């Protein structure tokens, strides 16, 4: 999908041409860059859609009249309420009571 | 990522060709004094997104269901549409009203009535307050309380809840039903 | 020096009717025949006629005296409420201590 995004905006794809070698030896670290630091951490495609359900309405035979895709979500538990306290002026440092 | 915690709202009503209006404050809804302005609320971005799922159905449907009745000349097609419109409109009312009875919602309703009746003692006879307990005004004050409690939490934008009411009023959407 | 006519209370002084105090402002007044008994031995009242000077010590940090003063502060002239007076102290005391 990222390729699609890129090619939409760029309209071309150009290379540093340091390959065939360079980016094969240096870097896979594109992988390392992706592995540790990022919040996007790598998952099996099985375990990504675990929260999604799907349900069809129907007619007599039947083909669906109404089809609804959803994410199973849980509400609550609490709603937090606080008063911020500034320890030093000009800064965002705060205790939140 | 957080929000200033304050809310103001007012329920208005006409009784015997006379209008009384009560305004209400957040700390009053939680039954305390005086008021502490310094406190804030953590925005419930998650919870809000869920109720949105409801909201976007109601409004976007009614909107498209309206433009549907214009393009539909056929009377058999039209009698179904206005059915579905009113149908889920009452479901909305049934929902909000349900919230209107809550720790806050009922505490909300009491405050309005209290301030209205105290308003009814001075301005004239109180005896007209009998009308507040009539079927419709009672359902009226309840819905309001419902939308008001939702707003005084991160759950309802005032801009979207107003546009929610327009849906509820665009279709008459009150079966009085005894 | 408040004068009132005893026959009609609601007319003379509405404010002193018990009827008012419990929240019935309607023509209806409390029904003279109803149920259950009681006797009051004691009550909670403040003192009249007292003007006192209270020293605040070297130390000694009298935990009641301050809590007593806070009340006198909110009382003897309005400063919010003695509830709102405390959570002001917490924010000061957090921002400082």
From Swiss-Prot, chain B:
Homodimer. Associates with the polymerase complex. It comes from Pseudomonas phage phi6 (Bacteriophage phi-6). Transmembrane segments: none annotated. The lineage of its organism: Viruses, Riboviria, Orthornavirae, Duplornaviricota, Vidaverviricetes. It is found in: Virion. This is Major inner protein P1. It comes from the Viruses. The chain holds residues 583 to 760 of 769 of the full protein. P1 is the major inner capsid (core) protein of the polyhedral procapsid, which is responsible for genomic replication and transcription. Forms a dodecahedral shell from 60 asymmetric dimers. Binds to RNA and may be involved in genomic packaging.
Swiss-Prot record, chain C:
It comes from the Viruses. Transmembrane segments: none annotated. It is found in: Virion. Homodimer. Associates with the polymerase complex. P1 is the major inner capsid (core) protein of the polyhedral procapsid, which is responsible for genomic replication and transcription. Forms a dodecahedral shell from 60 asymmetric dimers. Binds to RNA and may be involved in genomic packaging. This is Major inner protein P1. It comes from Pseudomonas phage phi6 (Bacteriophage phi-6). The gene is P1. The chain holds residues 2 to 97 of 769 of the full protein.
């Amino acid at each position: 999908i990222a390729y699609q995004d890129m090619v939409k905006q760029r309209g071309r794809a150009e290379v540093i041409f340091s390959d065939e070698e360079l980016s094969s030896t240096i870097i896979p670290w594109f992988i390392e860059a992706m592995s540790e630091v990022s919040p996007f951490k790598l998952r099996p495609i099985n375990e990504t859609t675990s929260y999604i359900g799907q349900t069809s309405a129907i007619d007599h035979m039947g083909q669906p009249s109404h089809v609804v895709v959803y994410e199973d979500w849980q509400f609550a538990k609490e709603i937090t309420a606080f008063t911020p306290v500034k320890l030093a002026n000009n800064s965002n440092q705060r205790f939140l009571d | 990522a957080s929000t200033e915690f304050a809310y103001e709202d007012a329920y208005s009503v006409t009784i015997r060709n006379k209008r009384y209006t009560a305004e209400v404050k957040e700390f009053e809804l939680l039954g305390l004094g005086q008021r502490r302005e310094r406190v804030r609320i953590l925005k419930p971005t998650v919870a809000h997104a869920i109720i949105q799922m409801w909201y976007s159905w109601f409004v976007e449907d009614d909107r498209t269901l309206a433009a549907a009745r214009r393009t539909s000349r056929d009377d058999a097609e039209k009698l179904a549409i206005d059915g579905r419109r009113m149908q889920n409109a009452v479901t909305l009312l049934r929902k909000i009203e349900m919230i209107g009875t809550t720790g806050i919602g009922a505490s909300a309703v009491h405050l309005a009535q209290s301030r209205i009746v105290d308003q009814m003692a001075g301005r004239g006879l109180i005896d007209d307050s009998s009308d507040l307990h009539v079927g419709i005004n009672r359902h009226r004050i309840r819905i309001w309380a419902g939308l008001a409690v939702l707003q005084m939490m991160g759950l309802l934008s005032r801009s979207e809840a107003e546009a929610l009411t327009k849906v509820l009023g665009d279709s008459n959407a009150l079966g009085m039903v005894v | 020096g408040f004068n009132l006519k005893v026959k009609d209370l609601n007319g003379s002084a509405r404010g002193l009717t018990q009827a008012f105090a419990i929240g019935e402002l309607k023509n209806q007044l409390s029904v003279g025949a109803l149920q259950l008994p009681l006797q009051f031995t004691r009550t909670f009242s403040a003192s009249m006629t007292s003007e006192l000077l209270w020293e605040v010590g070297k130390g000694n940090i009298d935990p009641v005296m301050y809590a007593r003063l806070f009340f006198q502060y909110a009382q003897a002239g309005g400063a919010l409420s003695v509830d709102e007076l405390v959570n002001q102290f917490t924010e000061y005391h957090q921002s400082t201590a």
